[PDB]
Symmetry: C3
Subunit: 538 residues, 3 copies
């Protein structure tokens, strides 16, 4: 039966009570919060919060407290949870958050912020932690934020969304947390740091009926729109109902984020997902994001996905699949591509992205990197290692001169002959092969004539893939085999790139101290020759 | 002479005592731990631990407490050390740890966990901190864990091993610690985060007699077996008796770890060491680890070492040596290679690894990267910078088509001529040079005949290094010099890759509007010619 | 009116008072610090510090305390700030710091360390936090360190410098801080970790009159001299009066630092700035630093700047500009280069640096990477993406064989003909084009004669850029066009690299079963020919 104590009393500077008044528990007088975990404590905690702000004192939650209205942590207040079991259990209604953090340097340490966790309910809708637009350098660290769900999509925030943690602040730190909710973490602010968190909503073990649809209670690990200058590092992101780490693109202008050294696996959509769903605009785009040094694997609809984004980089990641893909995604096969580039939803091109030094492992032999028609300005570095996957795939040969494939791409085309007069028709056995390495294309062209119709004058081979309307700095071609040409002794064929139409190669021949451009006149219906060389294009 | 206080008494909610009961010091009643640092306090601390778990209270160690049995931190309990001098001094016997952390979110902040620190003793054996197999998201942060040693190898854990911190948990955080013990940190769990630690056992200043042997009390900074999905970042790892950061491979299946932005230097074995000692199996392998952005230097038996591992990457590291190597390792020289690939101990190949964008500095001119016979599927990127080291070394020329050397490799071979009939013998001055860049090999072949024996018919040059049984997409060859051939005026030599045996080049000649394959008939005993060109192989 | 309490009294082990004595507030007796924020509290805080060190207790600052002399945090003491508004307001005079941290494991958590913040004053000079040369594994975490300024440069530290935080210790952690001062953070120690800080002195909104000059009160975000083995990661560095992150080079030997995953923008000098201002010496150099995965943009005098440094790497950064550059730097245009290499201030060469996998965006089309004359041993990887900037710029063609440009460089030269006897003069329409890719140079040379003067004998083309005195492993050249040569039927021109002078190409011709080196004799005043090929140089 020890002395009475209250944060409302005035004590002398030398007293036990003054010393104790530096730390406030909501169970202390005059707040007197319940300790049974079931009685509402919102009034007691709100009073303790306001007192600590007014008097400049530390607030420590020493139990798991039931609440029914938002706790607003403002004015630089820090909430410290006494133990990992302390914190709040939220019965806050739809349209409000359990905890709202705002102001300069406000934050929350430790403990638990727990929603109802009824993801099968078609009526419960809740939101966990909000850092609002006036949060500056706020934080939540070491906290289990779980159980915020909302079946069916909202039309507005007032419906309740199912966010675990939603950051709209500047410089927010989210670190050492466990976030598990319909949208585990949502990013809509600037300069945040999302570090060493465990992020999942465990869609794979949820029991929610498949296929996935917009009615699901299980979406992304990290969903980002209007996110700028975040660093997302050292997180363990897995088994989410949509993508592990997503940036849009869907009413969002998301730029300059750095996604590094995370593990992202077993998600039902993509692993790391950057793309445009809404049409590109000054207020909707995904630009200049860095994806580096991550391990991404067994994500159903591709491990690293770029759709219509620009100036992004994918460097030094290990992206892979194994046969557990066929188990966890049984019945619902997806793209199964290690690194895929695509158009935006409304056809926008991937522009200016940089893919280098990644290791892609795909035992199905699916292409480790895919490139779609329309992509421009991208660089596919030769430090990428696809030896344990399929080779890089391009959807059309014109990509080889509108992008730079240091990782080499090989293909074929059907050549034709363009006589100055008349015509020459080639047998179908005629064949052209190209390989692009950087801004060099190597060629082998086999020309087997099947018929002629009064050909005469100059002769060109056409059409070199990718070269239409391009120019070149240098090129080099030989003809190393021929048969049934009308050539005098000592006359040999020569070949040189057509500098007017640089997807054509001019074929001509020697005449002592000069050359002659009459090769079409030397062709017969049974002529054959083979051309080899390269073009350094601009 | 102030009021009595005890965590065993019941106080009113409004009392001083209830407020104080939220924080437990083991010196408080009823625990009454000694404060002299020499009296055993195990019973008092065990009681305080059990009380804090039962009552949901915070445990603070306010002295350095002597203990003789394991403290078990379970059930989400956090141990907070009051000051950097608080914590435990361990007299726990061999076969047990000083501290065992288990359960969900249990952990330890600050202070000291101190072993006997008698590394010269042939009888003292101790272990420091264990995160056991039931640890989930546990942690130790800000702690000096030192002095756990055990001279001579254990046969089982019950002997006592000499671990400083041993993590077998899921999601364990080890951060801001100083770990110094026979094995400073040992990793055998999943999804741990080993961040911004100081790791060393100071072998160089130990005075333990050299050479190193299995009886040493000084092994690795980080030793890992069955380690999955760790991030090891921002650590300062140095002067260890074996390797700085090691993954096996020796009864361990270690995969998907990310080792980034560490400094690793002056270790007696390797800096960052990934390899197989036990034979490769479904339960013993080292796969898909990422080594990125580290600074590794003056490690005696090589800075970055890969032995029989697969799908690993080494990207963007700076690996170097200076003349202090000759000082600290005087008398005991080692490999002194910046980045070395080797076979596993039982001959297993390095498969599918990716080495790019590293800067290697070796003033001895030792090769900055070494590649052994048998390696396959590896990619050596051209962004590596070995200008301040020796050039990349390959142990046999066949490696150039079973791996992809964007970082170019040059070599030589001795050509032969393969006449269709008869024989042609070349002088020893005949020479072939190749350079592989990616999937292109450039060649120069000088053919000087010394004798002939009735050669006639077709002619091939052989054997192109790496090309045996390979195919090609395109190739291009000329003969730009010859002497003492039997060629009529206007007949010139031609050369084209043999498409049946693509390590041979067919040599033939012109005959007006066709070509003729009778070159062996045009050779004399004094013939010479020189061939130049390239092959784009598949 | 509760019981008296004092840290000077002796209490029983079972007492309230003994429990309370583990935590010291400076307002407690016998220290009795003022709480008004204006009365000097230095004596009270110094006494509390000494008491906590002597008795092994925790020190908590529970108000913002005014101080007029340095607080020395030594002996492993930690200062904990009760709230984000607690800490110290410094009226310490010029030549001393507000707080000095030294010893093993000493540090400061939270709160504020506030200077006078009068950057317009020509007389106020102050310094914030010092980690001195005897600091080992000390830290400051979670602290706002602002307002330390000093207009005009010091001549010595005793003048007062304007440091926010100055680290000369070993292993110092600076994390989660806001640092804003004349020099926000200064690094002069070893193995520090500067993590997830906000760093700025807001030069752009200061109102200090422009142009910037050495009299400014606004210098770098991070200024480093004699800095070794730091990791600088996850910081938000912007709007500084000089550079964001600087290493010298100016009385400093700075090596082995790792600068990763930071955002650096809007600085008035450079973003990430490594360079030599003082002449290179054994005690002044910048070596082996790693710059990886940063986003650097709109820094006035270039985003990433290397001046006379060696063995550094720039890998995987996104470096860019937009039209806001023209707004914030209106009136004061700067270099506006994404990645620039330069000589040191005294002409020292950039040696051995590695630039790969960066994405450069410059809508002005300025070169994304610039290389100066004299640079050697550098590697410019082909994974760099400059498609959205100007192409890499080299200041002289000789750079192509003293560095390795995997990112290809194209240029031109004016050829000459070197007859064995006599002379040949070319028309000005004669032209040579080269492209260097790695250690391969491709060439196209057009030779149009305008006059001859008795030429006879052998013939060489000269001079190939970069090749003077170089050797080669292989090379391949053809002549694919000619006109007005004196060639009999069946005689064709041949070309081969001059192996004595490998910046010359020998031009000669066929003569049946041999070749003849008399090409100068076959030239006329109207001759033309075109040469194509490549050299693989060593």
């Amino acid at each position: 039966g020890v002395i009475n104590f209250s944060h409302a009393d005035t004590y002398g500077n030398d007293s036990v009570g003054a010393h104790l008044q530096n730390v406030v528990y909501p169970t202390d007088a005059p707040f007197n919060a319940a300790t049974d975990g079931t009685t509402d404590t919102t009034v007691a905690i709100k009073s303790a919060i306001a007192h600590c702000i007014s008097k400049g004192k530390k607030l420590v939650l020493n139990h798991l407290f039931m609440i029914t209205d938002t706790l607003v942590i403002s004015d630089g207040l820090h909430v410290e949870c006494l133990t990992s079991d302390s914190g709040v259990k939220s019965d806050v209604p739809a349209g409000k958050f359990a905890v709202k953090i705002t102001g300069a340097n406000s934050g929350w340490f430790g403990g638990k912020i727990l929603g109802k966790n009824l993801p099968e309910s078609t009526t419960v809708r809740q939101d966990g932690v909000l850092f609002d637009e006036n949060a500056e350098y706020c934080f939540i660290t070491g906290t289990e934020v779980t159980g915020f769900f909302a079946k069916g999509l909202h039309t507005s925030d007032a419906d309740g969304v199912g966010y675990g943690i939603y950051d709209k602040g500047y410089g927010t730190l989210i670190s050492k947390c466990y976030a598990n909710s319909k949208f585990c973490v949502a990013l809509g602010g600037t300069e945040g740091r999302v570090l060493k968190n465990r992020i999942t909503n465990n869609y794979l073990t949820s029991g929610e009926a498949k296929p996935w649809s917009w009615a699901s209670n299980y979406w992304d690990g990290i969903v980002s729109e209007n996110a700028h200058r975040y660093v997302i590092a050292f997180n363990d992101v897995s088994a989410c109902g949509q993508s592990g780490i997503y940036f849009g693109g869907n009413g969002g202008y998301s730029t300059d984020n750095i996604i590094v050294n995370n593990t992202v696996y077993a998600c039902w959509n993509r692993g790391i997902d950057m793309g445009l769903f809404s049409e590109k605009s000054a207020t909707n785009d995904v630009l200049r994001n860095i994806i580096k040094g991550n391990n991404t694997y067994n994500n159903r609809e591709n491990n690293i996905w770029l759709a219509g984004v620009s100036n992004c980089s994918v460097v030094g990641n290990t992206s892979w699949f194994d046969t557990n893909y066929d188990v966890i995604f049984a019945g619902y096969p997806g793209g199964h591509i290690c690194i895929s580039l695509a158009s935006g939803a409304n056809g926008e091109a991937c522009v200016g992205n940089t893919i280098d030094s990644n290791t892609c492992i795909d035992p199905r032999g699916n292409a480790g990197i895919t490139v779609p028609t329309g992509a421009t300005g991208n660089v596919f570095g030769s430090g990428n290692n696809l030896s344990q996957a399929g080779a890089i795939y391009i959807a059309s040969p014109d990509l080889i001169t509108s992008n730079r494939f240091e990782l080499a791409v090989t293909g074929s085309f059907t050549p034709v002959l363009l006589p100055e007069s008349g015509s020459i028709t080639l047998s179908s056995s005629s064949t052209g092969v190209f390989r692009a390495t950087g801004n060099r294309i190597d060629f082998s062209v086999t020309v087997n004539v099947s018929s002629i119709s009064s050909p005469s004058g100059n002769l060109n081979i056409a059409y070199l893939p990718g070269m239409s309307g391009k120019t070149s700095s240098t090129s080099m071609f030989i003809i190393d085999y021929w048969n049934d040409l009308t050539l005098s002794s000592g006359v040999i064929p020569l070949a040189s790139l057509n500098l007017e139409n640089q997807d054509q190669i001019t074929v001509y021949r020697t005449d002592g101290g000069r050359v002659l451009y009459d090769f079409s006149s030397l062709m017969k219906s049974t002529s054959s020759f083979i051309l080899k060389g390269f073009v350094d294009f601009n």
